[PDB]
Amino acid sequence: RKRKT
Amino acid sequence: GKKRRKLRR
Amino acid sequence: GTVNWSVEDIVKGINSNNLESQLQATQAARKLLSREKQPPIDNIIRAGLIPKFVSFLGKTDCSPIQFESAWALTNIASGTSEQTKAVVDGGAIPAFISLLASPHAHISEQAVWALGNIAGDGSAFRDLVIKHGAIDPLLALLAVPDLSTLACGYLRNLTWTLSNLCRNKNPAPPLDAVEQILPTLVRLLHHNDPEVLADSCWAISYLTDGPNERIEMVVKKGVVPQLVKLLGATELPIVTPALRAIGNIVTGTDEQTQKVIDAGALAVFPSLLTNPKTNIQKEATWTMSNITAGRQDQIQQVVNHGLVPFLVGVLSKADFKTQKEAAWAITNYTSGGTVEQIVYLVHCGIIEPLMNLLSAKDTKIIQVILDAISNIFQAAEKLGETEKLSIMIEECGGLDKIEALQRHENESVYKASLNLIEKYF
Fold this sequence. Notes:
heterotrimer; A: little secondary structure; C: Leucine-rich Repeat Variant; 28 helices; elongated; nuclear import signal receptor activity (chain C)
């Protein structure tokens, strides 16, 4: 789910 | 800003 | 007296076997290189002058020619990569690291500035500067009881350079160098000078970009609190890197994210998500999307701070890049949320502006919104309300939009669009 950067 | 030119003391 | 010589004049004098004759030419060259309009860097380089300048740096006898070389060489290093390379090839680096020990503040300052330009150029030079041992004496300039006894410009320069030793990412700076720099960094993060605070935040920002192991290093120094105070600053040169630091931290682990929330960051976001500077708005919404991509405990904190209305707000009317981040915020939220949480999102008026963005020349976002619209319906099935939900979507013109998307230049877009029409229309 998390999106770097 | 990555690099910097000195133009006066 | 030494204003506007020819480069031919500068060469003739610097080649003379006369130290005062050389000093006046090196002062001519410096005034050339620090003029406002286009400085003649390539003629100087091509004149063959970098090596004689580099040698003047070691003339501890003549303090003033050290300064003028340092300055000249600084300004050559401030140009293109090919140009910085000329300075580095001359053997400048070990020479400047020597100058850091100088008893003359204005000379050590200049060597700081110069190393700054050299490390600023990119990963390879940054790493070379560290291999030559710059970090030990740089930090020793800061070994004082109280930073305020240092001169403004000095401190600011010194901060800018440390900041370039953290910059440039792949390859990220050596873990060993980072471990050593962080205490001084944390200390600068607490100094009251907006420029010092700006470049400190930029450094942290640089460090916290990348792998979660890197994030941990920083967060374990307990700077997350101070970062959030900076988040509420009024000077946009401070808020911007402060915000990018916080936003980097919350791409990491849930435990890392919770340090940010626990530190009260969410209280600042109504201000940040309605900020006039577009660049702030876009990065604040991006930050939100990586919080709503967290634990249900953590999503609920987004809710309690009344941030969902602000997301609905950004979805409604920001510039497109910001709206693109807002979609992710909503998709991530509907991926990890309670039944009750997805209901709240709908009750805050999420459906109408979600549909307007189905009319956007981008597939990437359409893919995102469709996935979001899906998860809402799935929560609608678990509460038996998919009737009322499909009405809303039609009553606001969503189905006019959705239907026409089966006829779309894309595989998984035409797929998921008509997958909805099947199961619900």
